PDB file of C-alpha atoms in Angstrom:
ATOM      1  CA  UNK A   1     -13.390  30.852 -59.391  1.00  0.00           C
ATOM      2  CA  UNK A   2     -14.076  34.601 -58.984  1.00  0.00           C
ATOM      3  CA  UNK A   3     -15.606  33.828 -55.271  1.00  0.00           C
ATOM      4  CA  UNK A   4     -12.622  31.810 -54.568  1.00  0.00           C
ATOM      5  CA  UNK A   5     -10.609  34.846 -55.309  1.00  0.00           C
ATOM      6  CA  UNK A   6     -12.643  36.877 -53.672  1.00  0.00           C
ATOM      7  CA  UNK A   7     -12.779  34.313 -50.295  1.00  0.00           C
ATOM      8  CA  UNK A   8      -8.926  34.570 -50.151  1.00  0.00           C
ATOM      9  CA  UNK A   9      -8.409  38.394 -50.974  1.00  0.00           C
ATOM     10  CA  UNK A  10     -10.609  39.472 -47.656  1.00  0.00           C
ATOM     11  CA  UNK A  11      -9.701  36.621 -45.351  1.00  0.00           C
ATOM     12  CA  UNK A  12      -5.577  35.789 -46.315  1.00  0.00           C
ATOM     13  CA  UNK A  13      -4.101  37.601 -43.582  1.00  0.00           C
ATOM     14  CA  UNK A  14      -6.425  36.209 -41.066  1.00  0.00           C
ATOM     15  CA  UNK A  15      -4.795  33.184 -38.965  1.00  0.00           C
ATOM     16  CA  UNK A  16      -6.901  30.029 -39.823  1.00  0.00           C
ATOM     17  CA  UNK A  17      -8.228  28.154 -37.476  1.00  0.00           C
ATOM     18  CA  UNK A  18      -8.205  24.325 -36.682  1.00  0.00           C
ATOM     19  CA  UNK A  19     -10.201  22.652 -33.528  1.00  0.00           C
ATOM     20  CA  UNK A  20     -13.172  21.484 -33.808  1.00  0.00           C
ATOM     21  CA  UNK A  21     -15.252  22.460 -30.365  1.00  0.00           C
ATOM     22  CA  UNK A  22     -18.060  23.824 -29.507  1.00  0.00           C
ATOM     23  CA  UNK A  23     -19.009  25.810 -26.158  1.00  0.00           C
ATOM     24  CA  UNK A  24     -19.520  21.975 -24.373  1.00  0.00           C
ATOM     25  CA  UNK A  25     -16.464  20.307 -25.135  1.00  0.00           C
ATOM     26  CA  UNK A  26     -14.197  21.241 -22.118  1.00  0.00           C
ATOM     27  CA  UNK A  27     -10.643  21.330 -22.607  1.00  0.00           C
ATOM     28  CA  UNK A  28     -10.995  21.267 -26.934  1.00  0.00           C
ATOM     29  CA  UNK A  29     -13.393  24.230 -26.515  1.00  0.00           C
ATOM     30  CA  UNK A  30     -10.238  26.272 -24.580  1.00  0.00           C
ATOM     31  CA  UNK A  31      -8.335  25.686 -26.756  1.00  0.00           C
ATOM     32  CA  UNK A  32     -10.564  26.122 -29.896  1.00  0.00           C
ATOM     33  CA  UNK A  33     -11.228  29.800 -27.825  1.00  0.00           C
ATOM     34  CA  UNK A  34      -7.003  30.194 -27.760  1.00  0.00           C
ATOM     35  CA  UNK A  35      -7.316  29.986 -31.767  1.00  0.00           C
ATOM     36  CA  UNK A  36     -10.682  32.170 -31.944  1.00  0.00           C
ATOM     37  CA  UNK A  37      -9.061  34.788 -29.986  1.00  0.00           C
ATOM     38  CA  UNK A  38      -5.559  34.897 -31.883  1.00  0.00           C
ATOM     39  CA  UNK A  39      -7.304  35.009 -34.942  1.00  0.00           C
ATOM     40  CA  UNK A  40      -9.428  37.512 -33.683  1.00  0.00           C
ATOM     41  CA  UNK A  41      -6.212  40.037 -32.220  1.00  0.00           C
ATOM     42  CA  UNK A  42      -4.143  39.615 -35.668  1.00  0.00           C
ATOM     43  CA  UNK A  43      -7.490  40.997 -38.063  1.00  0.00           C
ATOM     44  CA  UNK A  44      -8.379  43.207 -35.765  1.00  0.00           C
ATOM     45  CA  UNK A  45      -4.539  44.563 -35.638  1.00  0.00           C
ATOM     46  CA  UNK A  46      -4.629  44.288 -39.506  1.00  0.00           C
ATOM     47  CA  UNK A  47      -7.809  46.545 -39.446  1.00  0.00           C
ATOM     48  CA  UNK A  48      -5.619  48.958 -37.444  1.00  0.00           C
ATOM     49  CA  UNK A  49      -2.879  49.466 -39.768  1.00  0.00           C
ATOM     50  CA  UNK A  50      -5.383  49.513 -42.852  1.00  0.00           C
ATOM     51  CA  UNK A  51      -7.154  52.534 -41.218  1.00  0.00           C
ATOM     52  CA  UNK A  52     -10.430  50.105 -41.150  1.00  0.00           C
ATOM     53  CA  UNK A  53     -10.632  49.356 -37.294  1.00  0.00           C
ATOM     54  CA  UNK A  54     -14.188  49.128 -37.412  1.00  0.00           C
ATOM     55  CA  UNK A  55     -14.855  46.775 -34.158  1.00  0.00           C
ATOM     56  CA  UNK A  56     -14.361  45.767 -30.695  1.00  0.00           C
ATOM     57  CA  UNK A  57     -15.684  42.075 -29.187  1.00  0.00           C
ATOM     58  CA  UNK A  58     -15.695  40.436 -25.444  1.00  0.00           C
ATOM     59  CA  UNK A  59     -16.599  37.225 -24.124  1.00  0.00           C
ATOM     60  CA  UNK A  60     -18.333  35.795 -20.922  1.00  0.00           C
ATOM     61  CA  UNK A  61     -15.448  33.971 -19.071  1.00  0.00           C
ATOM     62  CA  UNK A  62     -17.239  30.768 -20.652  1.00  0.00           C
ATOM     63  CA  UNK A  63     -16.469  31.940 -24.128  1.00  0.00           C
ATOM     64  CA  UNK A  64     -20.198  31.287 -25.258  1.00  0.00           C
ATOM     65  CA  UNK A  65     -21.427  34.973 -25.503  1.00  0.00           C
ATOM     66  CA  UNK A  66     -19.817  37.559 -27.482  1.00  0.00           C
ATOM     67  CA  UNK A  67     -20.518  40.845 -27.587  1.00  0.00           C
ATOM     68  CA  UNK A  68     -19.333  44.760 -28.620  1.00  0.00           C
ATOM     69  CA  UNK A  69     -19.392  47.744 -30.878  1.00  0.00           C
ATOM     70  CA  UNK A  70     -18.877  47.888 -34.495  1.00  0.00           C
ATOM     71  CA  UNK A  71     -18.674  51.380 -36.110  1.00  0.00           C
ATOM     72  CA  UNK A  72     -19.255  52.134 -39.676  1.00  0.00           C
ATOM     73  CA  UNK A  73     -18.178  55.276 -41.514  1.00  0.00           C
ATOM     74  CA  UNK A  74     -20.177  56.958 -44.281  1.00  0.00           C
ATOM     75  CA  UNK A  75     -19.740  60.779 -46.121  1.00  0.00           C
ATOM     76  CA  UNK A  76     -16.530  60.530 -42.921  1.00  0.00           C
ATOM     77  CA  UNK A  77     -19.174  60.025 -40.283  1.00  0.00           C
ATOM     78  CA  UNK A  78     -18.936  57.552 -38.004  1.00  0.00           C
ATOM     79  CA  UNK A  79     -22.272  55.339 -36.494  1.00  0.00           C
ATOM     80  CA  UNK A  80     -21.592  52.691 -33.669  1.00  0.00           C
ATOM     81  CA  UNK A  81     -23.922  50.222 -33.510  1.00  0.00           C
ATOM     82  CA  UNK A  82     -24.208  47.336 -30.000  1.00  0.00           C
ATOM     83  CA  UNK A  83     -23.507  43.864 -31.381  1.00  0.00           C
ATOM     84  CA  UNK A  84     -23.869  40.210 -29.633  1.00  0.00           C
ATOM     85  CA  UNK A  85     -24.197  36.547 -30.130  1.00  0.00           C
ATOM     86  CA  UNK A  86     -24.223  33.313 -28.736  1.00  0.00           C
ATOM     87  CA  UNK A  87     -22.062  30.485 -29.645  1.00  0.00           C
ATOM     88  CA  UNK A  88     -24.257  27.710 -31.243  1.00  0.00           C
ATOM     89  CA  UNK A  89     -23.849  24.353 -29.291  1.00  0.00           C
ATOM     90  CA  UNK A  90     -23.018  22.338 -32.724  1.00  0.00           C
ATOM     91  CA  UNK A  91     -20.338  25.978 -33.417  1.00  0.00           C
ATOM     92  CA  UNK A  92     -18.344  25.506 -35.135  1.00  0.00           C
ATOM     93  CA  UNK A  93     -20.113  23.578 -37.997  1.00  0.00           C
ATOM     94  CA  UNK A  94     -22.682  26.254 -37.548  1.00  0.00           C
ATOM     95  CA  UNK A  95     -21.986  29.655 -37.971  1.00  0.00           C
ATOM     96  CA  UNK A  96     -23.341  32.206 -35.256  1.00  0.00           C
ATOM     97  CA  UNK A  97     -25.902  34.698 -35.634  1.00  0.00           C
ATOM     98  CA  UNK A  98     -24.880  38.322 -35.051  1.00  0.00           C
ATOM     99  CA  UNK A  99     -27.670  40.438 -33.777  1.00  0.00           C
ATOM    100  CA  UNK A 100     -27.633  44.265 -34.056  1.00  0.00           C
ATOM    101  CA  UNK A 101     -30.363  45.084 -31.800  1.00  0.00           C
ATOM    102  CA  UNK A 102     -30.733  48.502 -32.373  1.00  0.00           C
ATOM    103  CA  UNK A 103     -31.635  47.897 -36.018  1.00  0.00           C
ATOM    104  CA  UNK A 104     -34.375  45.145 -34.862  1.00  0.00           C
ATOM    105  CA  UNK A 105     -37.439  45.586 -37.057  1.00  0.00           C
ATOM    106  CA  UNK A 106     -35.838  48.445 -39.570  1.00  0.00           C
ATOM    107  CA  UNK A 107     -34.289  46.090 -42.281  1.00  0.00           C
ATOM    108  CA  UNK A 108     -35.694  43.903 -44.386  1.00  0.00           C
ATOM    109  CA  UNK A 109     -32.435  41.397 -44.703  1.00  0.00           C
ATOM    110  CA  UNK A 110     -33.099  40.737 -40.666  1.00  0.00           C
ATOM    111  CA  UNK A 111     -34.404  38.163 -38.151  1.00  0.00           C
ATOM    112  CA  UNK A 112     -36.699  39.437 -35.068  1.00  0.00           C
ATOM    113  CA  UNK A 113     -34.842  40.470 -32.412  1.00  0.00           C
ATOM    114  CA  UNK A 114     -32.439  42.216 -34.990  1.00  0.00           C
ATOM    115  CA  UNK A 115     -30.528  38.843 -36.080  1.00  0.00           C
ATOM    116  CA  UNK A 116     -29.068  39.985 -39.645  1.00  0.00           C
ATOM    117  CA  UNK A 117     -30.053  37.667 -42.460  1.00  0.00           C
ATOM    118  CA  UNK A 118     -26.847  37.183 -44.443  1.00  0.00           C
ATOM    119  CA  UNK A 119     -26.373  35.864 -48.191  1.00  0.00           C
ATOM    120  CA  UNK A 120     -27.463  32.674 -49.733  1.00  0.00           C
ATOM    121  CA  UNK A 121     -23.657  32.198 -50.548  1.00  0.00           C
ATOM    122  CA  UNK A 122     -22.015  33.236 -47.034  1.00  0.00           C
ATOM    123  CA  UNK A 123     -23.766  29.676 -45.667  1.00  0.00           C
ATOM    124  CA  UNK A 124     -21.835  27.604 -47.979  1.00  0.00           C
ATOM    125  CA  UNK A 125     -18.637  29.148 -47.965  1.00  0.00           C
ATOM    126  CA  UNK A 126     -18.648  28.741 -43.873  1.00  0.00           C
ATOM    127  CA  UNK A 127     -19.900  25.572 -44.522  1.00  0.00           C
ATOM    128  CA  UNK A 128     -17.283  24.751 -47.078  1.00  0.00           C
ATOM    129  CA  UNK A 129     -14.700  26.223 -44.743  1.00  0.00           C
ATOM    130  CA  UNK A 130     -15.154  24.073 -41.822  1.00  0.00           C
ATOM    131  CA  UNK A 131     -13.519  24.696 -39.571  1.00  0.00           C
ATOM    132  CA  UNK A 132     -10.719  27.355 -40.329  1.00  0.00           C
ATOM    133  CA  UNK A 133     -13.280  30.014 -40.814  1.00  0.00           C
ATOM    134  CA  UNK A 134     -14.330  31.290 -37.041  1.00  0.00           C
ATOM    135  CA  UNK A 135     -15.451  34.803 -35.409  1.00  0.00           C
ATOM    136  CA  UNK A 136     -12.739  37.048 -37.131  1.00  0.00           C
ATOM    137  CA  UNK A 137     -14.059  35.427 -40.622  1.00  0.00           C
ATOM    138  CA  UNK A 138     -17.532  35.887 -39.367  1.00  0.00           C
ATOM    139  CA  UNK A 139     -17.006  40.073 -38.829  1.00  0.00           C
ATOM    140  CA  UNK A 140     -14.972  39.998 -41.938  1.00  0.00           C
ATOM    141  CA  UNK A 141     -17.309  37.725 -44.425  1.00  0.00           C
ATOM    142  CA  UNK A 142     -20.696  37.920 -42.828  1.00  0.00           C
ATOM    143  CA  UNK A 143     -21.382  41.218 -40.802  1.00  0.00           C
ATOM    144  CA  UNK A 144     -18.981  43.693 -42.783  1.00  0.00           C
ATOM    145  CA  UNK A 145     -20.549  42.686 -46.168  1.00  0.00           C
ATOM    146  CA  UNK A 146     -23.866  43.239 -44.364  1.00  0.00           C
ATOM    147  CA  UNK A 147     -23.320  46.822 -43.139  1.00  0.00           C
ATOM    148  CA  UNK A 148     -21.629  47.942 -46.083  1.00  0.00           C
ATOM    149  CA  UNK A 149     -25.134  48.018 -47.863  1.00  0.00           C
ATOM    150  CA  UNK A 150     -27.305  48.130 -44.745  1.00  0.00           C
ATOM    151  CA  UNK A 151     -26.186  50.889 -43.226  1.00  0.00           C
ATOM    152  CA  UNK A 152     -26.314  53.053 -46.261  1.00  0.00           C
ATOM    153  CA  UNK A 153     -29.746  52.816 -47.256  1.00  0.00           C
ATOM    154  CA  UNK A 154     -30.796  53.075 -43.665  1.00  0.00           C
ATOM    155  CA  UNK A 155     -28.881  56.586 -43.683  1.00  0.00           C
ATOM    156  CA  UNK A 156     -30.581  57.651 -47.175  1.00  0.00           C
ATOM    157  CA  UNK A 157     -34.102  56.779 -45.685  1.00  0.00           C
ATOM    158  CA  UNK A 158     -33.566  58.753 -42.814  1.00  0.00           C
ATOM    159  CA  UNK A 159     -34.560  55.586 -40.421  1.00  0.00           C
ATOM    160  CA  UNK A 160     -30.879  56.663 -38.581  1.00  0.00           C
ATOM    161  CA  UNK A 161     -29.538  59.588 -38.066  1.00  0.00           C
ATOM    162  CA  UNK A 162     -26.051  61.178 -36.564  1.00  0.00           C
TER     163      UNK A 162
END
């Protein structure tokens, strides 16, 4: 299966992750946020090395809201762009929904309140996945995908600018 392939080629190196615990579930949701934040530190340390570091996230002490920059290069320049989400309760069956706010009302594959709209087939494969996939496979499946034709055609419009 070419999607299998494809699953496996982005996410490999990323640490898998096991509990499953959502932001109410006390000492399983610490230690679901030990795994999230491992996995987390290793891609980001693989983006690094790959010359692809292309994010930064924090937490509320809780663990429930996430938020940061992500920056994404095009023709060598660089645009940074706020990002945030909260952890759904029924997380992490659920995936989360990444918001870009700044983009809020300027792309068609978006919620209100700048929410992006990802793929029909990034739903199942999280779903699929459950629940090894978490925020590092979330970044690396759902948003980078996303801003890698996004961001573009917002530049070529002229709706962003430098």
């Amino acid at each position: 299966s070419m999607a299998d392939e494809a699953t496996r080629r982005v996410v490999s190196e990323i640490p898998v992750l096991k509990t499953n615990a959502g932001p109410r579930d006390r000492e399983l949701w610490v230690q679901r946020l030990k795994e999230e934040y491992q996995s987390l530190i290793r891609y980001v340390e693989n983006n690094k090395n790959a010359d692809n570091d292309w994010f930064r996230l924090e937490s509320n002490k809780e663990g429930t809201r996430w938020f940061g920059k992500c920056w994404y290069i095009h023709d060598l320049l660089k645009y940074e762009f706020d990002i945030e989400f909260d952890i759904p309760i029924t997380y992490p069956t659920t995936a989360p929904e990444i918001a870009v706010p700044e983009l809020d009302g300027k792309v068609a594959k978006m919620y209100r309140g700048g929410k992006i709209c990802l793929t029909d087939h990034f739903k199942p494969l999280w779903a699929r996945n459950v629940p090894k996939f978490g925020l590092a496979h979330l970044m690396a499946l759902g948003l980078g995908p996303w801003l890698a034709v996004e961001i573009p055609d917002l530049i070529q419009k002229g709706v962003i600018h430098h």
